[PDB]
Amino acid sequence: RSFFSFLGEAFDGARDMWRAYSDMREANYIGSDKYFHARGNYDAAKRGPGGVWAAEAISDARENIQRFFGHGAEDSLADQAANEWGRSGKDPNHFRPAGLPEKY
Amino acid sequence: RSFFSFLGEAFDGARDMWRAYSDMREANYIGSDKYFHARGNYDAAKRGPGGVWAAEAISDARENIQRFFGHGAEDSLADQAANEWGRSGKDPNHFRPAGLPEKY
Amino acid sequence: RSFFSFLGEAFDGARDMWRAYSDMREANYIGSDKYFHARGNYDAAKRGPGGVWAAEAISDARENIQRFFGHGAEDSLADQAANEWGRSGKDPNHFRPAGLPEKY
Amino acid sequence: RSFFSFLGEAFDGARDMWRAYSDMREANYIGSDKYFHARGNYDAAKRGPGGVWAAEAISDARENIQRFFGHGAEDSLADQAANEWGRSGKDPNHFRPAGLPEKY
Amino acid sequence: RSFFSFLGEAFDGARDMWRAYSDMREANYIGSDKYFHARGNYDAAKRGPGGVWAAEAISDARENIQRFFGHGAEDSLADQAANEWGRSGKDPNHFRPAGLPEKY
Amino acid sequence: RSFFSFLGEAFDGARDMWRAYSDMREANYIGSDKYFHARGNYDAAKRGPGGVWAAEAISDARENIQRFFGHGAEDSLADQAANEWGRSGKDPNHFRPAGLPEKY
């Protein structure tokens, strides 16, 4: 039964990762990147082990795709630290920009 | 226009990775793991950059999921080397088991 | 980065279009067609350019499928005007039936 | 038009069935199985005929997959009765565990 | 590891079931229904246990959807026997119509 | 029953449209655009009415997405004529470049 739960946690983790980027686009707040990268990872990790796995799979692929197209080396490191913070169960609101609406 | 090719190459790379594991199940040949972990990576990489990205995203996730459930540390390293060989465009038949049918 | 945002806006636009028809079925209000056709298009357009594109792709296909099966010519024109109203950022509540619940 | 509505009801029924198991994992309440099996089926059936069809397709497949892996015969019968109760429009809260949060 | 094979066998079984109906539409041979309802079940079952499960899940849903729309009771029984024959690994060409092309 | 064939023809038409662009990337032949924009439309239309509908839905969306990103007005017209030729069941090899391999 644990395998089927792990997969459900993974798809749910995938949806929470998607929700973070969907919200990032909606907010349109400059310098919110770190907050949503931590939140999607935090939410996915909260689903369980499948969520942790899905968040890491999605974060690594995103980082690699941006790298290929022209995303700066130092800029990728900041994205990497924000993902790890959330995934480790630490508070995403740590990277929260001051004027971001309560919904996010 | 290079962005859509990249995505098409990625989905195609994803299908070639799927095809490798689908074939691995069909063959039912003991030792295969490596050859196939490397055929899928070779075929996906051949699609273009999107295929390389998709093969790596899929290989890393597979390795991590196997690790969580109970796959041995040394056993994962062999799977890792096999994936890299194929993805780098080197010949997969290098890891080919002697009694494997021509179709694979 | 704009291409990846355009695709996210498109999938989100696709979900908002789906949500409009899902809600239309739930409400079961006679003569609500115009309201939900405008709302799904309005919501999708609000996501951004990807949403505008997805709303138009979905609206054109829906109109063409109904035409093939037996939907009246004049009946299609009313569906067409309602989609355009919403997509152009104009208020969907313009086509709102008087006894429709607040949730919709 | 009824066929397209039946399919929309089915996908929506599929989502309500998924939502029940996603919620079951979130709650982590022991002996909640019956409640969520009835709720997902009740919610899906409420969508319409497509929802009834999708709930039954999903419930039968779930029951068969668990049977193959090692789920007890008597244990499957309890899962079967809970699915039927909900699908028939009877109150899921009938199987509600006393300390389960209001959201579920 | 038997869990992932089961899922891969299921998706592959799902594709073989799809392929049977896709081919049924292509052939446009009157009487086919049975042979094809049984070729798809045979191919899916050949994938392994996941394929058997997927063929049965797909066959039961198809039978139920056809029943709701207006498919005759006696007509459903013939479809039921044809599915079982294939799924049990028996030769599908048993129900083969005389003038059906070699590709099918 | 004509409704399910229509949907199956549509998904199959969608796959044939995908196959055309997947092949276009593989070939890497300069000028192809048209032949392929017309092979996919021909193959999809051959599936039946669902295929015709899916080819048109896909062709219109592709044309609109290309327009938004920076595709020239005159360049879009050539893509439009090529799609119509194929979809109308006329021979795609009409736009075939002289040095294109036999597989395509």
Curated annotation (Swiss-Prot), chains A, B, C, D, E, F:
Subunit record text: Homohexamer; dimer of trimers. Can form amyloid fibrils after partial proteolysis; the native, undenatured protein does not form amyloid fibrils (in vitro). Apolipoprotein of the HDL complex. Binds to heparin.
Pfam family, one: SAA
Swiss-Prot/TrEMBL keywords: Acute phase, Amyloid, Amyloidosis, HDL, Heparin-binding, Methylation, Secreted, Signal
Cellular component terms per the entry's GO annotation: cytoplasmic microtubule; endocytic vesicle lumen; extracellular exosome; extracellular region; high-density lipoprotein particle
Region named Disordered: 80-104
Keyword Ribosomal protein included in the entry's annotation: no
Induction field: Upon cytokine stimulation.
Main function: Major acute phase protein.
Name of the protein in question: Serum amyloid A-1 protein
Impact upon substituting residue 72 to D: In allele SAA1.2
Subcellular location(s) of the protein: Secreted
